[PDB]
Amino acid sequence: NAMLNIVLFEPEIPPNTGNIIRLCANTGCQLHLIKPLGFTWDDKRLRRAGLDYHEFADIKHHHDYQAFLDSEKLDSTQPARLFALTTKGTPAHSAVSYQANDYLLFGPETRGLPAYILDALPAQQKIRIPMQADSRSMNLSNAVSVVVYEAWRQLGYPGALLK
Amino acid sequence: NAMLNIVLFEPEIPPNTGNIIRLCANTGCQLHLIKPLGFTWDDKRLRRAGLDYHEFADIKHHHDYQAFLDSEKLDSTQPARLFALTTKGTPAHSAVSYQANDYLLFGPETRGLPAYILDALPAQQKIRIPMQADSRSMNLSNAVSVVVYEAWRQLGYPGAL
């Protein structure tokens, strides 16, 4: 079972998604992609970038946001254990108490998440990774990495090789 | 003087470094780059890449590891409060307790750090990022972000909005 469900809404920049595929494979997360993507999906490019088949073969691809909600049995209005990562959020990523299988939703690199998705979530389900005043948002793949490793830490790193 | 010192040894892959520059500026860390660089350092290329001058203007550039140690007044026999990320490490990055002005050292994505650096550090100063069995290399910017945010969390996110 998926440590976390990492959900990218209309991702734009190929290397970010490539980095996230690698991250999810290393940590036991299930990656979900919501179309339209800003790049064309291509098995051959993913392999050339160094990704192994089993890293990308089992990614879930969703036609649109409501189809993602329906597929994952998330209540469209008040979705269970869905958190949106946004600079517009309230709690820090480390202030949420994660559970296995939580859904973590990230926006596109240029636009961020649409207003109708954020306006429908309560403040406590919109997570802001801390940044200094005046900052440029995070790189998308860095944002995902930070939240994934924080959640995994809280969970006691289930599935990690021990040293 | 710095909240945290992020130190890249022989940074290779130019977009990784760019992403780290932005991470450091967002979190309020002091970035150090130890030569030789694997790419050509050019303010005009950094700007074309989306970085703003204030993000890179105050980076500390060092000619080699010893020059870094000397600039920072660290003892090469056992550098104090320097934590090196390495698959050869013992504690998880989250299993050590960070302090203001700590040094967090990262080698290239693939090669990692040389023995002359790691041999001077005790086991508890060599940190690893946990991974599942049969994992593959994590992107270096993503790794640095993980370590930085864990250390900055432990400090109480000082400076965060």
Ligand SMILES: Nc1ncnc2c1ncn2[C@@H]1O[C@H](CSCC[C@H](N)C(=O)O)[C@@H](O)[C@H]1O
């Ligand atoms: N500080 C932060 N906290 C939480 N998520 C962040 C973040 N910085 C970037 N992200 C994630 O990365 C995605 C792409 S960055 C989008 C930036 C957009 N200009 C904006 O107004 O914020 C975001 O949609 C969000 O999911």
